Design a protein around this nucleic acid. Structure first.
Length: 191
RNA sequence: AUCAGGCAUUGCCGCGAAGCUACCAUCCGCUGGAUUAUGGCUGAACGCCUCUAAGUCAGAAUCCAUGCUAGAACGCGGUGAU
């Protein structure tokens, strides 16, 4: 159709700032500061109320208005990242060989050492992305909680940790062994 | 004659340094980036879902480099003495 005009509403919570110039969304909030440049999309933002910001696409398309709702999603994810933040719980699932996971330091860099995964002599090194914090949580045996602000920091840290412990040259339906993201949620309680 | 030699298409036999040479001998043959397949992240389209659409992570003996050989006899630079 080439949609003459379409827009998306982006709500702004009670104690956060949104700084947009030419396409650099810089959200500040109680947790801290998140930056993300959207110079790849070609949309227009407009502050109406200091609490709603309307993002818009003029003479849109099927592939174009899809991105307009995508950018609303990414910007809400940033506001969530500063207001409440993110917290991914992963469980160690092992059949025989218990997974030995701990956070070590190599030249002050924050790695996650994985040793004794299917009794593998290898020591798997998962570099913790800055802004992501690792907690080997008590009260749940064989759990690891990756918390912080930016969803793409938390999610890719959790994903890169899951991917390195993939069993090779086996029936992956019998050898159901590795560290899997059980829960994806927010840091703040009363929820 | 002796000694010492000639000729036998290098007279033949044993040893024979130097030279060349043999997986028949010895030494030596590097580690970064980007990717494919594939598995993923965030994530719309399609109130969910989704690795894909925007963006992105990981990644092969592949590709490009580090390296190695040559050096354009019409590519070039610095320098000496003239």
């Amino acid at each position: 159709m080439k949609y003459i005009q379409t827009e998306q509403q982006i709500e702004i919570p009670e104690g956060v700032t949104v700084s947009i110039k030419s396409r650099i969304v810089k959200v500040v909030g109680p947790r801290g500061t998140l930056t993300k440049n959207l110079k790849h999309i070609d949309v227009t933002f407009t502050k109406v109320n200091n609490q709603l910001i309307k993002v818009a696409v003029h003479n849109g398309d099927r592939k174009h208005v899809a991105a307009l709702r995508t950018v609303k999603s990414l910007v809400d994810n940033m506001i969530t990242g500063v207001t409440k933040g993110y917290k991914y719980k992963m469980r160690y699932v092992y059949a025989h060989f218990p997974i030995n996971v701990n956070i070590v330091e190599k030249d002050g860099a924050k790695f996650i050492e994985v040793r004794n995964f299917l009794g593998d002599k290898k020591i798997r090194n998962v570099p913790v992305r800055d802004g992501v914090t690792i907690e080997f949580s008590t009260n749940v045996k064989d759990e690891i909680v990756l918390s912080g602000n930016s969803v793409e920091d938390v999610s890719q840290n959790a994903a890169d940790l899951q991917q390195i412990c993939r069993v090779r040259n086996k029936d992956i339906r019998k050898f159901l062994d590795g560290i899997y993201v059980s829960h994806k949620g927010f840091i703040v309680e009363d929820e």
